[PDB]
Design a protein around this ligand. Structure first.
Ligand code: MW5
Ligand code: MW5
Ligand code: CU
Ligand code: CU
Ligand code: NA
Ligand code: NA
Lengths: 219, 219
């Protein structure tokens, strides 16, 4: 559905890597433009410090979405909630994206949007390549014989706004801890789909990442 | 205990990245030399294709360990087993290392050796930074409310040889699947300690990794 999705673009982190260029363009703008071109996307709520607004506002008349801003909160989830208060009163779906993932492919965004529409909550993920284990408080491996297949979550995270709101309300009403980027939905009974993305959708955290990102962009 | 540990250096993978230089020295030699200098280490069994033996044999008279070779097997575990058949009949401990991890620090090797001696089985690991979840066959997140803290396993993997042998025998006698780098020990009831290592102990898999490795070596 055209113009049914609101994007919350998380660009509130502080050194900032998401404004450093790749091929002359600030990292945040890559995903921003990917989303703007998609007919599905009605609006982009950028969550960023006022200082960086111009980075995005420069393109406002050139992009085929509405542009809005929200103020960052203290933790990532707070930034999500801030963006959430700015989305359209009738968008059917919210698409949360870390601006430090510039390389997300349109085709993968399309996938997670569809899955999110279908299921109600979906996140892009890839199978974890390393050997990963739970470790207990005595620093021992928690052993599994069964087939635990672990996936690394990326973004977008796509969710029906009502469902997200229900999660934030539960976490507030019960004072629940939020310890990774899917904790809010984990407290709900509603299913979360994992849409298979691409290993190229890396998050730029380190200086190493800047050249890797630039090197993928080479294509 | 001086000269109590046998190292199995896994260098049988095939493009090969573990022989590509960092600062002019083949990646495999970095960990090789780290181990050779440690008084604990009696011997290094290198598991590598005969073609590359000279890479290591060149240094034989210069290193304070015995050097032995084993032939790679088909899968990593087979390479482990091949090396295992070459270690000293009385070493108290075997230290399995991926040669593609050149940056392992002496101090972290010392830690996992101690832990392995104490517990019987230990592996170097670091806390996973990404959000990682189990995903079921319907591509849904397997939700946890509890505090699952996930760690990424590195090498060394340090184990009493008898315990390793018992694992390989069990996996053979029962035809058990080996699907990640701790599966053999997971079938045993004996505990596996996770020694906290360093995020710098990366595995060189990609071309990206070669520059990251080189860039860490800069120090
Ligand atoms: O559950 C969420 C979600 C919502 C979500 C999760 C997975 C799939 C779709 C939406 C978001 Cl966007 N951010 C955080 N931080 C902590 N938990 N959390
Ligand atoms: O359990 C092992 C071990 C032994 C081990 C695991 C963890 C700690 C110490 C030794 C090794 Cl070296 N390699 C593999 N491949 C598959 N399983 N597996
Ligand atoms: Cu990175
Ligand atoms: Cu890598
Ligand atoms: Na401009
Ligand atoms: Na030489």
């Amino acid at each position: 559905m055209e113009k049914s999705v609101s994007v919350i673009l998380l660009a509130g982190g502080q050194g900032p890597k998401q404004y450093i260029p790749l091929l002359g363009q600030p990292i945040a703008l890559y995903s921003f433009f990917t989303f703007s071109r998609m007919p599905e996307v009605k609006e982009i709520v950028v969550v960023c410090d006022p200082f960086f607004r111009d980075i995005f506002e420069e393109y406002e008349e050139s992009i085929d979405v509405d542009l809005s801003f929200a103020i960052p909160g203290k933790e990532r989830q707070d930034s999500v909630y801030s963006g959430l208060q700015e989305i359209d009163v009738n968008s059917e779906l919210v698409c949360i994206h870390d601006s430090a993932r510039p390389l997300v492919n349109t085709e993968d965004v399309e996938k997670v949007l569809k899955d999110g529409s279908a299921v109600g909550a979906a996140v892009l993920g890839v199978p974890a390549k390393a050997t990963i284990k739970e470790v207990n408080s005595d620093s021992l491996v928690v052993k599994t014989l069964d087939r635990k297949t672990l996936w690394e979550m990326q973004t977008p995270q796509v969710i029906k706004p009502e469902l997200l709101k229900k999660g934030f309300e539960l976490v507030k009403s019960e004072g629940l801890e939020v310890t990774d980027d899917v904790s809010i939905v984990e407290y709900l009974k509603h299913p979360v789909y994992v849409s298979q993305g691409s290993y190229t959708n890396i998050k730029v955290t380190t200086p190493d990442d800047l050249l890797l990102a630039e090197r993928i962009l080479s294509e």
